């Protein structure tokens, strides 16, 4: 309708367009309208109702700090260890000219014409954590290790971290490993067929792992097996920093040992000084986490949610009241989510670190010892529907590591992570497979050779062990029985959905989804830690609980969790055909080549981007509430998340063996596989047509690659139409329970170019859509496109008519 206006974004300016493909005025520069500093950048905005506009702004000059050790009581009050450092904010100002810089949620109100009047601003404060002089999350943060982010130029070998020591040498030792079977019963590994099963990966070499107050380096290794220092900050700081500088320099030099990804970091949410719109080192890891934890938002009946970036893991999220001026963040570490079953929740928790009633060490800082759940997630997106919030995220790999000073220790300088893929002898049906004991508490998977046919998963699992096939197949944490009280396992977090980075085919099969059973009814065996997708519907009362958790000043509720019961996990691997060696001795991570075109140099790690909810316009049954489902885009396919509208819960069936109806993955075609997932600038859903539109701006690609060469195909656009498929819930009268999950379908409709810069796209009608282009002076090249079922092509007559 002529009366309705479409809002298009250009940096900070929100220009309102008419269905005549013309602006109604210059637009609204949110930064200036909110009376904020020029360093502020607009990242996410949501049009609320008709008389409201909510936005998300973040300054690159923001500087955060975590105060660790050297303190006493008597004078120290209820102060937060996480606080804004104004000292470095005024120091970082030196860029061009001037004449806490915290993120803000902005509220606007509609005035006559296409104008907005500034109403109020809500401060997005740091999450609360009690300082020191089993209720202490502070210890975890004191000894926390976070990996440098994954760039679209990071190759497969860059993630490949050298395999650790087997659990037979951990519990027994070097020289007496041959007594595995004869003594595994009393050690807690009864019928365990995995002696040479790798416990994790070594941390002495590879991609840098930096603490909260330490900083991520711009240079990353091509092959983490040969080059890189990993956790060793002092080894980098003293000689390897200069090694990476001379070999990998910025444009202003062989590139054989390291890669310069400064441009790639900036185009993710990472603050890179000297490379901004308006050598040295990048800001604190805790500061980068804050700058990346403010990328997405949603508004519900007076509540504003804020979540992290889809490329950088977020350790917290905001839930702030409209009336509130401030509002501290809620941790994911204190947010208990339903993983589908009680066993599915266990797998991830029982890898976060070491926990036993024997240990009570100050250096035993791991989440499990501090009684905390999964702390990080790569938020694919969020949305609101039927007075309820809906989210989807790729669970970031949070594991443990040995902080021992004893170099002779087998687990010394290594992170503990094992393959959690269900055994080959596991019972059929989703529930029976996801609940399988295979690596619940410790390693079990690895290379098992059956005559001449090798298998990367355990052939003996559950309770089918022993002789009579009744004996339990035991599994336990890779820490020696007598070393349990003195154990100092801390917490480590990865920048990908992988728990394990160990250079082996077992971790390759978890990432690519190649673990199957030898049954005629071939079922794909699931990982319960690697390539995991979390999704769920959260209500206003569950949301309020997250706010109250953040607003708490330690006191008694320093351990208390946020209960989100309507959530579930799902094993979502990358396609195998995305990797060159498996097309449509063996191989490991480093030996895996990439043939991936979706704007990723790695054919190993998965990426979930741009989630959007939507109410199916289809006529519903006599009484029943209108059906709704949320859709997101992953590597190699479209995934639809279904929900029950009559109860505002996750859609579940009568039979537990049958795969969940709440989850559905539809793999997409050849044309849509050439689409870069990182270039997504907008996700629009049309209520009247029931179609999703994924608008990819080529300009969202960085300036230079890892080898500091100008990025090609930066000019252009590509659109993906996502439509519903299959039988829906309450499609007719007799439709009660569903056996097959209602899915979606991704197709590159026809709205695509590689020669023009995109201003945006206007959905004029169900039949016609417009394409506004940039580049030259003024900007306003309009192109009218027509469709049928979804096939798009430009109407030469109407395009020439507007122009
Ligand atoms: C993850 C892991 O470490 N798997 C092991 C497995 C498991 O230990 C086993 O499945 C359960 O205990 O054993 C593997 O060992 C076999 C392998 O070394 C082959 C090599 O040819 O030999 C087999 O032994 C045979 C062989 O004929 C002689 O060595 C022996 O005198 O008789 C045996 C037959 O009775 C080993 O069992 C396996 O691949 O199955 C090695 C894995 O690393």
From Swiss-Prot:
Main localization of the protein described in the UniProt heading:
membrane
Query: What is its membrane topology?
Result: Single-pass membrane protein
The protein's UniProt keywords, in alphabetical order, are: Cell adhesion, Cell membrane, Membrane, Signal, Transmembrane, Transmembrane helix
Cellular location of this protein?
Answer: Cell membrane
Q: Name one GO biological process term.
A: cell adhesion
**Compositionally biased region (Polar residues):** 175-189
Where are the stretches annotated Disordered? Answer: 87-99, 171-203
* Basic and acidic residues bias spans: 223-244
Record's GO cellular component, any one?
plasma membrane
Task: Specify the protein name.
Answer: Mgp-operon protein 3
Recite the lineage of the species.
Bacteria, Bacillati, Mycoplasmatota, Mycoplasmoidales, Mycoplasmoidaceae
- Which part of the full protein is shown? 23 to 996 of 1218
């Amino acid at each position: 309708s002529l009366a309705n206006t479409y809002l298009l974004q250009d940096h900070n300016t929100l220009t309102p367009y008419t269905p005549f493909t013309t602006p109604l005025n210059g637009g609204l520069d949110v930064v200036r309208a909110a009376h904020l500093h020029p360093s502020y950048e607009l990242v996410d905005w949501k049009r609320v109702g008709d008389t409201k506009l909510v936005a998300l702004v973040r300054s690159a000059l923001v500087r955060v700090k975590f105060q660790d050790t050297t303190s006493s009581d008597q004078s120290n009050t209820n102060q937060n260890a996480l606080s804004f450092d104004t000292q470095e904010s005024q120091k970082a100002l030196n860029g061009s000219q001037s004449g806490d810089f915290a993120s803000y949620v902005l509220i606007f109100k509609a005035a006559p014409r296409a104008t907005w009047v500034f109403e109020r601003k809500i401060k997005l404060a740091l999450p609360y954590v009690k300082q020191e002089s089993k209720g202490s999350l502070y210890k975890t943060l004191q000894d926390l290790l976070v990996e440098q982010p994954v760039t679209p130029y990071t190759p497969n070998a860059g993630l490949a971290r050298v395999n650790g020591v087997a659990q037979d040498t951990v519990h027994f030792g070097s020289g007496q490993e041959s007594s595995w079977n004869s003594q595994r019963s009393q050690k807690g590994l009864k019928n365990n067929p995995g002696p040479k099963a790798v416990t994790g990966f070594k941390l002495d070499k590879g991609r840098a792992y930096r603490k909260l107050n330490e900083s991520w380096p711009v240079y990353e290794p091509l092959d983490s097996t040969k080059e890189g220092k990993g956790k060793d900050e002092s080894s980098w700081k003293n000689s390897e920093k200069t090694t990476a500088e001379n070999d990998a320099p910025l444009v202003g030099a062989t590139f054989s040992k390291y890669l310069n990804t400064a441009q790639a970091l900036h185009q993710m949410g990472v603050i890179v000084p000297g490379l901004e719109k308006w050598t040295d080192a990048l800001p604190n890891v805790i500061t980068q986490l804050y700058h990346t934890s403010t990328a997405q938002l949603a508004y519900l009946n007076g509540q504003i949610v804020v979540m992290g970036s889809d490329r950088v893991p977020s350790l917290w999220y905001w839930v702030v009241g409209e009336d509130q001026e401030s509002g501290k963040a809620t941790w994911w570490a204190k947010t208990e989510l339903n993983w589908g079953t009680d066993k599915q929740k266990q797998f991830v928790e029982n890898q976060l670190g070491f926990k036993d009633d024997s240990n009570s060490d100050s250096k035993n800082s791991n989440l499990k010892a501090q009684g905390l759940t999964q702390p990080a997630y790569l938020i694919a997106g969020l949305d609101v529907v039927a007075d309820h919030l809906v989210f989807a995220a790729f669970k970031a790999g949070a594991v443990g590591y040995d902080m021992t000073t004893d170099s002779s220790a087998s687990t010394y300088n290594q992170a503990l992570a094992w393959s959690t893929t269900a055994g080959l002898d596991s019972d059929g049906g989703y529930k029976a497979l996801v609940e399988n004991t295979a690596g619940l508490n410790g390693p079990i998977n690895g290379l098992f050779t059956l005559l001449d046919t090798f298998a990367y998963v355990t052939p003996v699992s559950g309770m089918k062990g022993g002789s009579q096939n009744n004996e339990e197949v035991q599994t336990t944490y890779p820490v020696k029985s007598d070393q349990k009280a003195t154990a100092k396992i801390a917490s480590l977090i990865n920048a990908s959905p992988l728990n394990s980075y160990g250079d082996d085919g077992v971790t390759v099969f978890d990432a690519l989804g190649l673990n199957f059973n030898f049954k005629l009814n071939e079922e794909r065996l699931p990982s319960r830690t690697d390539q995991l997708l979390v999704y769920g519907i959260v209500n206003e009362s569950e949301l309020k609980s997250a706010r109250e958790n953040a607003q708490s000043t330690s006191d008694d509720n320093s351990n208390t969790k946020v209960k989100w019961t309507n959530t579930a996990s799902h094993y979502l691997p990358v396609p195998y055909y995305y990797s060159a060696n498996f097309p449509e001795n063996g191989v490991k991570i480093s030996t895996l080549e990439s043939q991936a075109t979706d704007g990723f140099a790695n054919s190993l790690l998965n990426f979930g981007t741009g989630l959007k909810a939507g109410v199916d316009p289809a006529p519903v049954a006599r009484g029943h509430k209108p059906n709704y489902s949320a859709v997101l885009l992953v590597r190699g396919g479209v995934v639809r998340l279904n929900f029950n509208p009559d109860t505002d819960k996750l859609l579940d069936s009568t039979d537990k063996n049958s795969e969940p109806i709440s989850f559905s993955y539809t793999p997409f075609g050849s044309a849509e596989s050439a689409v870069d997932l990182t270039t997504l600038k907008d996700v629009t859903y049309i209520a009247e047509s029931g179609l999703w539109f994924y608008t990819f701006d080529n300009g969202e690609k960085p300036t230079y690659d890892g080898k500091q060469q100008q990025v090609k195909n930066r000019k252009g656009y590509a659109v993906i139409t996502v439509s519903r498929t299959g039988i829906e819930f309450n499609e007719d009268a007799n439709t009660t329970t569903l056996s097959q999950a209602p899915a979606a379908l991704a197709v590159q409709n026809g709205i695509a170019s590689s020669q023009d810069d995109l201003t945006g796209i206007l959905p004029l009608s169900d039949e016609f859509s417009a394409v506004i282009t940039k580049d030259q002076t003024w900007t306003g090249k309009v192109d009218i496109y027509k469709n049928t079922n979804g096939l798009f092509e430009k109407d030469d007559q109407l395009s020439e008519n507007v122009k």
